[PDB]
Amino acid sequence: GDVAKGKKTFVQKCAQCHTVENGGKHKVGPNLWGLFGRKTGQAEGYSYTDANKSKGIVWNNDTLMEYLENPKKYIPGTKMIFAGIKKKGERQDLVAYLKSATS
Numbered sequence: 287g288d289v290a291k292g293k294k295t296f297v298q299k300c301a302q303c304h305t306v307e308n309g310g311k312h313k314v315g316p317n318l319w320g321l322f323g324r325k326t327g328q329a330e331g332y333s334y335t336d337a338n339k340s341k342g343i344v345w346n347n348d349t350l351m352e353y354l355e356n357p358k359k360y361i362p363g364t365k366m367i368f369a370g371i372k373k374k375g376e377r378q379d380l381v382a383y384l385k386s387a388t389s
């Protein structure tokens with residue numbers, strides 16, 4: 287996807303609850319550094335819901351694309367209160383930025 291477009295999407299819709307940098311602080315949600323290739327709910331020091339911790343899947347392009355379309359549907363009981371990015375293209379650009387900014 288388009289990393290530059292994804293960044294603006296992140297700043298507009300995710301930044302209020304997330305940081306991406308290495309050593310980043312947990313805000314409402316967990317810092318996202320090292321997200322790709324890691325199982326759900328593994329950010330150090332963040333108190334996840336049992337649901338986010340128990341999902342058991344590995345975060346990558348396919349799982350993130352599905353999750354971000356409708357967070358609560360993918361992880362029922364999650365405390366991430368966000369409706370989701372409905373447009374596929376916008377979601378792909380965001381994933382591209384996420385992959386570039388979290389490693």
Ligand code: HEC
Pocket residue numbers: 296299300301302303304314315316321325326327328329333334335337338339354363364365366367368371380
């Ligand atoms: C606050 C109002 C939030 C907004 C806006 C977004 N997210 Fe979030 N996210 C938030 C919380 C409180 C949590 C933990 C939920 C739980 O049940 O424990 C999360 C979690 C995620 C995750 C999973 C991280 C992991 O499993 O380690 C991801 C991938 C994530 N959030 C991504 C994300 C993106 C890209 C957002 C913008 C589109 C976004 N979140 C917004 C709270 C909030």
